[PDB]
């Protein structure tokens, strides 16, 4: 994820790693 293009489910993979157990939102 170190400077990569987060497309589709790849965006969900990193947001689960960055936010951790805090949750996130991406759509919409």
């Amino acid at each position, epitope marked *: 994820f170190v400077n990569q293009h987060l497309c589709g489910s*790849h965006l969900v993979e990193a947001l689960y790693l960055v936010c951790g157990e805090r949750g996130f939102f991406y759509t919409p």
Partner: antibody
Amino acid sequence: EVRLQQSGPELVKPGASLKISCKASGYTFTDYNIHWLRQSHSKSLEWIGSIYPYNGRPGYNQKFKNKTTLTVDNSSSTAYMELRGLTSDDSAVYFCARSRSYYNGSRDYWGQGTSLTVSS
Amino acid sequence: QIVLTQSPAIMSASPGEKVTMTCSASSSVNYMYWYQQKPGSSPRLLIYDTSNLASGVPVRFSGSGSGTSFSLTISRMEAEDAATYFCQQWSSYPLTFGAGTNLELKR
């Protein structure tokens, strides 16, 4: 060619512990996540957890958070999963999976499977 | 937390029919996956991100669906396509899988 190699079949007694390896090759091990899955009966798939091999930060499922530890080795490019307090309900086949490639990636990679049997 | 209910659990079709399976979720799902597993083999990716076809898989497979309802469709049923097909969501964590749809050939 990206290939994930796991350990052989394991047979351990209840209450004991065990660690399962997953050797990676053919790609930058630090870039892609390493997911772990459990195949119990032939028609069930449970997601154990993931790990980022760059810093070693893992993400566990609440069901397996108590009795699972995900470690990683940057030097050997190998991911590991240790299960503590193994019971007969944990006897299953476990898989390690790598996420699909970025952008133009249309193929993920799964291990060959690690058959685990807990019986005294 | 999202429950993936696949329907039907078992279905039969002769090598040449048009197979259509369904995977429904308890909540809204943005990205859906589809795997094909045979006895003694690892699950092979067939459809990633709802509608994108994987590599190596023949073009007869097709994924569709949006929101809470998804489906996997095979145009021309072939002999080698007899296996069990699972659905997996990647919208919300933790990652959940479907019950599985066992596909058998008709005789």
